[PDB]
Amino acid sequence: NFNFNGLTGTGVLTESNKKFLPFQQFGRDIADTTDAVRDPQTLEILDIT
Amino acid sequence: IGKIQDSLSSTPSALGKLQDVVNQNAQALNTLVKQLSSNFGAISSVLND
């Protein structure tokens, strides 16, 4: 389970290779669900599966 | 028997029946997947929130 800034869910996290732009906060897939998230505190990007 | 091979090869519109079968199946599945995004008169389409 995870909870990121009020966003809750379950799944596994891995190093995502996307080129997130500075003004983008969170990525979301084709089914309007969060796919990749830009981590808080330290700035990294992780995917959800 | 020699000519039939090149006759088949030249024309690109012979396998239309199988093509439409596959396309109809895929379109139905895609629409069913897409339908999940509706709010249906509710506040949001996400159950967790």
Side-chain angles (χ1 to χ4, degrees):
Chain A
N1 314 289
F2 57 83
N3 174 5
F4 277 3
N5 313 330
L7 198 154
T8 65
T10 84
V12 70
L13 307 175
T14 323
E15 165 48 29
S16 68
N17 264 319
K18 276 147 201 142
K19 301 170 154 200
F20 261 50
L21 290 202
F23 64 96
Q24 288 155 341
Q25 290 300 319
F26 58 93
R28 150 219 53 61
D29 69 353
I30 196 169
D32 44 51
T33 56
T34 83
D35 176 26
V37 60
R38 169 181 280 172
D39 305 332
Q41 315 199 340
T42 171
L43 277 310
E44 290 84 5
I45 47 174
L46 300 170
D47 62 337
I48 296 169
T49 287
Chain B
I1 297 295
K3 317 139 185 146
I4 177 62
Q5 176 143 24
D6 82 5
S7 162
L8 256 189
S9 176
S10 65
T11 320
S13 60
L15 308 188
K17 325 195 79 57
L18 323 174
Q19 267 300 329
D20 319 305
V21 159
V22 180
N23 297 355
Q24 294 167 336
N25 188 10
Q27 178 184 3
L29 257 185
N30 195 1
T31 298
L32 184 52
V33 166
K34 154 269 168 179
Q35 278 298 115
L36 274 174
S37 71
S38 301
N39 290 335
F40 264 125
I43 57 170
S44 298
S45 62
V46 59
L47 265 60
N48 274 353
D49 159 3

